[PDB]
Design an enzyme around this catalytic site. Structure first.
Site, PDB file in Angstrom:
ATOM      1  N   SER B 197      37.707  44.491  39.802  1.00 52.99           N
ATOM      2  CA  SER B 197      36.493  43.596  39.578  1.00 52.99           C
ATOM      3  C   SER B 197      35.211  44.457  39.819  1.00 52.99           C
ATOM      4  O   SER B 197      35.006  45.412  39.083  1.00 52.99           O
ATOM      5  CB  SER B 197      36.601  42.261  40.349  1.00 52.99           C
ATOM      6  OG  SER B 197      35.591  41.205  40.083  1.00 52.99           O
ATOM      7  N   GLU B 324      41.489  35.044  35.168  1.00 51.91           N
ATOM      8  CA  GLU B 324      40.381  35.659  35.820  1.00 51.91           C
ATOM      9  C   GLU B 324      39.288  34.614  36.321  1.00 51.91           C
ATOM     10  O   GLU B 324      38.599  34.870  37.304  1.00 51.91           O
ATOM     11  CB  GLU B 324      39.709  36.646  34.843  1.00 51.91           C
ATOM     12  CG  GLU B 324      40.523  37.869  34.397  1.00 51.91           C
ATOM     13  CD  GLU B 324      40.562  38.986  35.436  1.00 51.91           C
ATOM     14  OE1 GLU B 324      39.899  38.882  36.470  1.00 51.91           O
ATOM     15  OE2 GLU B 324      41.305  39.969  35.258  1.00 51.91           O
ATOM     16  N   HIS B 437      42.522  36.740  39.654  1.00 50.60           N
ATOM     17  CA  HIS B 437      42.053  38.137  39.712  1.00 50.60           C
ATOM     18  C   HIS B 437      42.325  38.691  41.108  1.00 50.60           C
ATOM     19  O   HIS B 437      42.221  37.974  42.065  1.00 50.60           O
ATOM     20  CB  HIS B 437      40.611  38.251  39.252  1.00 50.60           C
ATOM     21  CG  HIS B 437      39.674  38.087  40.378  1.00 50.60           C
ATOM     22  ND1 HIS B 437      38.965  36.944  40.559  1.00 50.60           N
ATOM     23  CD2 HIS B 437      39.389  38.885  41.419  1.00 50.60           C
ATOM     24  CE1 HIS B 437      38.245  37.049  41.645  1.00 50.60           C
ATOM     25  NE2 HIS B 437      38.494  38.220  42.194  1.00 50.60           N
TER      26      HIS B 437
END
Ligand SMILES: *[C@@H]1O[C@H](CO)[C@@H](O[C@@H]2O[C@H](CO)[C@@H](O)[C@H](O)[C@H]2NC(C)=O)[C@H](O)[C@H]1NC(C)=O
Ligand SMILES: *[C@@H]1O[C@H](CO)[C@@H](O[C@@H]2O[C@H](CO)[C@@H](O)[C@H](O)[C@H]2NC(C)=O)[C@H](O)[C@H]1NC(C)=O
Ligand SMILES: *[C@@H]1O[C@H](CO)[C@@H](O)[C@H](O)[C@H]1NC(C)=O
Ligand SMILES: *[C@@H]1O[C@H](CO)[C@@H](O)[C@H](O)[C@H]1NC(C)=O
Ligand SMILES: *[C@@H]1O[C@H](CO)[C@@H](O)[C@H](O)[C@H]1NC(C)=O
Ligand SMILES: *[C@@H]1O[C@H](CO)[C@@H](O)[C@H](O)[C@H]1NC(C)=O
EC number: 3.1.1.7
Lengths: 532, 532
Positions: B197, B324, B437
């Protein structure tokens, strides 16, 4: 005798017509208006003066002056739609098929032909009313109306060419049916008007127009609705096209009177020859001389009339064919031809899109392209061809019809919706065009009942079911036979929005016809184009 | 001895660490910069002055000052991401795991943690490098960097708080690794930087920044790319947020110097306490203090750098998790909760949409809603919940990554793309959040190899395959073992755009990852928002 009928315009003599081993009476070529000729070209129609003696109504009348498709000479697919009688400005006639023996008071169905408002004939073999009159025991009328500039040239403000006079021809025939059909055994209290493409839009327009509503009971719209983007223009746009028509013919343009006088001197073919030069855009599915939103026939905008309930509240049965775009793509879009599969490149797609949504800006074109492109497979020639077929159909026919349905159903008294997706086994057009607009008509008029026309048994049965749905609806307001054993076509309601497929397989009921695309065409795209 | 290492900053003593029945060496808490404290708060980092004596590198260092998630106290799902050591502004340290016996010249992998640029720690149990160092025989480094205002407060024009200083911390650690990793047995010519990320965006940013490119060989981006909409702001927007931060703390705002001086007097927690008050919109997946497009770290806009090839040309391996969006919806969107299925009403959908695309006007919101709504089923609570998960994921993670990939691949030297869609059998978050995520990280670091952590055998095997893909790629530029028997992860090329799924089932190769939605997010929607 059964063939002599006294009407309020005078006496009429019909002819005895064979049909499927039996016979009925036909009265063809009955006049309902004064010939709209000379100084009455472009004028509202006037009622036909009554006649002495017996009017011979044994043969079809002339067809109205119109563009004649010569794209495929000798090809029955295209020629089945062209005038099969001489053309004349003296063309305001109707035809009636009457069961034998003459009924006393039976359901009446009045057919209004399509043709984009630039063409059409009441006399085509595919509109022969004898099979339907005979099989369902209705009185079947077909009317005519002026098309092209003769019907729709619009110089709003003038009384000499005010616009909408083709719609007034149709109204006038409906007035005559109201006034006289009782003498043929028909019930003036039970008249269903029905029509296809511009014929279906026309039906919608008489539903909306205060001046027409009272002249019929009920309505059937095949692949056409009054709000279609092609079916009307503003008075400003009509004016602009009339002036451009004058310019193409070297008319004096200083006033309405000088223009109108110049156009009235022209032979009919001189108008037809330049009619397609006045379109504002490079487009397909756009016609030059169409109804105008005039403040009279239509008192306000079609959308405000729809939203407000300003329309006749009755029952309607309506629907669309699966492949409404394919004709116009064939005729007008690069990459499509009659004797190939017409696999379309990406570049012919994009061009297609531009022709199909001429009024869109670039962002609008991108929105349409995105909606219809499978980006995992964007060079598939068949996907592109079919995607464009869908764009043309959805934008021009399906989605406007769907908007009409949903608006009408809020205030109306019963809606029946269909999706006709049977491709006839003897269709002469290529396979890629699929279930082409207009190819349900032959089922509605019973052609599959005639052995020599080469339909299958299952096509005969589909035709009988459809004729009986249509006549039962005309008769009662509901296409289903009450308390019979066959699957029920359900009402379309605001909540659940059911429809059926029309084809040779067991009935299936679905909901929300093309809803994903019609949200795009009815809500998102117009909002985009207004904002940008 | 194996645990004493002489570096150019001085001597360091590590500790022997057990791992899967064997042992390796760890050197934890090595300083790479001067403490950024006092008058150096907000400043670029300075190199660590060398030390006499032996630096004890036996225990983890402090974690940087940061927001601490207390949304679910005692819940391991959320707490596995919070600081597990004391927090301090004195937090610029790195950790190294070294195989035993000490290698001579082995592949080095440097981990850069995520956390939205507002959080993260190098010391988390899920980032324990010993399993990967041990199993793949690499030298594994984890660095740290200043987060939040401490890392990213940006008053462009000032030298006292210029912005991007967290990215400069990361650069500085990479400089130290370049300069010193040889003494640990690592090969400074074969350093792969990897992160997840904001860690993945960060990796992208060192690929782009001229000042960072030379300090590493190759790069792995997990669910993050430098062009993500959340990962940078303009110097004007950074300035605006720094000033608003000052206003929240009753600072003098008359000049940069007075503001900066006021913020430097504040205890760290006073900044953290008001950090989320400076966001311009009511939003989710937007963080207050992030990289700024400053004309130095980044010489031009990220998109012009991408288009022009102004970036390091090397091999990259990158990818995304299936779900996500689910974290940010859970935390920030009405209707989503941790202990329900979170079926979302139509009205919570619409609200979700507005939070997810805060910068959109109404027409943009309609475009997004249309793209993700199934209008045949628009009140399905699960479809709405999943549709929003997809909107958040696609807009914030997947589609920006896909744009980066396609731009990078034109000029780069080999791209490998993955889609991780295995949901771990012991996940403590609810099922509705799917493959969240960050939950590939535990596979990348080998947690499934530890019996007590409750993974399945097939999860152990997925972890080993992924670790070996990652280390083989770091080592050679290709994740596949040359001339072995196992299915080959193919190169992603501009033409065919292949990728693989990462999960416990036999490899499957696909093409054009989420292409339909990424055309919407990368081409159509931005064009709409620019025009309107
Ligand atoms: C079409 O019209 C008739 C009425 O004009 C509707 O039937 C009426 O239904 C109301 C509401 O239930 C009743 O109070 C009356 O008893 C009915 N009147 C008559 C004369 O039957 C009928 O429901 C309408 N159909 C649709 C689909 O709207
Ligand atoms: C990555 O880089 C190397 C070259 O820098 C590429 O291999 C070269 O390929 C060219 C084109 O075929 C050949 O002329 C050379 O023989 C190769 N050079 C070397 C040193 O091998 C390689 O193709 C690139 N890989 C990708 C995916 O772009
Ligand atoms: C009416 O016209 C048809 C065809 O022109 C003709 O055959 C028929 O005899 C006419 N009827 C009479 C009695 O005039
Ligand atoms: C029916 O089919 C035959 C033989 O294939 C053909 O010649 C004939 O034209 C068809 N009839 C019609 C009316 O199309
Ligand atoms: C380094 O620190 C650890 C923990 O504080 C301690 O146990 C260890 O003995 C120290 N090493 C030396 C030799 O100072
Ligand atoms: C493994 O499962 C057991 C029993 O269900 C549980 O109490 C334990 O916490 C689990 N271990 C871990 C590390 O999650």
């Amino acid at each position: 005798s059964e063939l002599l009928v006294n009407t309020k315009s005078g006496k009429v003599m019909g002819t005895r017509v064979p049909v499927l081993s039996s016979h009925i009476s036909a009265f063809l070529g009955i006049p309902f208006a004064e010939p709209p000729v000379g100084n009455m070209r472009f004028r509202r129609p006037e009622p036909k003066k009554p006649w002495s003696g017996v009017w011979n109504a044994s043969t079809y009348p002339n067809n109205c002056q119109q563009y004649v498709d010569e794209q495929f000479p000798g090809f029955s697919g295209s020629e089945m739609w062209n005038p099969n009688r001489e053309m004349s400005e003296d063309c305001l006639y109707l035809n009636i098929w009457v069961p034998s023996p003459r009924p006393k008071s039976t359901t009446v169905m009045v057919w209004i032909y399509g043709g984009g408002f630039y063409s059409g004939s009441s006399t085509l073999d595919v509109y022969n009313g004898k099979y339907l009159a005979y099989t369902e025991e209705v009185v079947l009328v077909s009317l005519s109306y002026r098309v092209g500039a003769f019907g729709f040239l619009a110089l709003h403000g003038s009384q000499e060419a005010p616009g909408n006079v083709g719609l007034l021809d149709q109204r006038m025939a409906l007035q005559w049916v109201h006034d006289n059909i009782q003498f043929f055994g028909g019930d003036p209290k039970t008249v269903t008007i029905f029509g296809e493409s511009a014929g279906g839009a026309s039906v919608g327009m008489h539903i909306l127009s205060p001046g027409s509503r009272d002249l019929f009971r009920r309505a059937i719209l095949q692949s056409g609705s009054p709000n279609c983007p092609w079916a009307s223009v503003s008075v400003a746009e009509g004016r602009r096209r009339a002036v451009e028509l004058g310019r193409n013919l070297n008319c004096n343009l200083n006033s309405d009177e000088e223009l109108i006088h110049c156009l009235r001197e022209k032979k009919p073919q001189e108008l037809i020859d330049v009619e397609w030069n006045v379109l504002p855009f490079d487009s397909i599915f756009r016609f030059s001389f169409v109804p105008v939103i005039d403040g009279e026939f239509f008192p306000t905008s079609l959308e405000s009339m729809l939203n407000s309930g300003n329309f006749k509240k009755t029952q309607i049965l309506l629907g669309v064919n699966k492949d409404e775009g394919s004709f116009f793509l064939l005729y007008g879009a690069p990459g499509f031809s009659k004797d190939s599969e017409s696999k379309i490149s990406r570049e012919d797609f994009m061009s297609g899109v531009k022709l199909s949504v001429p009024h869109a800006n670039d962002l609008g074109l991108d929105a349409v392209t995105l909606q219809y492109t499978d980006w995992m497979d964007d060079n598939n020639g068949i996907k592109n061809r079919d995607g464009l077929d869908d764009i043309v159909g959805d934008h021009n026919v399906i989605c406007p019809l769907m908007h009409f349905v949903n608006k009408y159903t809020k205030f109306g008294n019963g809606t029946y919706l269909y999706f006709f997706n049977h491709r006839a086994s003897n269709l002469v057009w290529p396979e890629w065009m699929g279930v082409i607009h207009g190819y349900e008509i032959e089922f509605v008029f019973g052609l599959p009942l005639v052995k020599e026309l080469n339909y299958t048994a299952e096509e005969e049965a589909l035709s009988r079911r459809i004729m009986h749905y249509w006549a039962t609806f005309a008769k009662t307001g509901n296409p289903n036979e009450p308390h019979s054993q066959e699957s029920k076509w359900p009402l379309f309601t605001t909540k659940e929005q059911k429809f059926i497929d029309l084809n040779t397989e067991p009935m299936k009921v679905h909901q929300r016809l093309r809803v994903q695309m019609c949200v795009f065409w009815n809500q998102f795209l117009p909002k985009l184009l207004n904002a940008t």
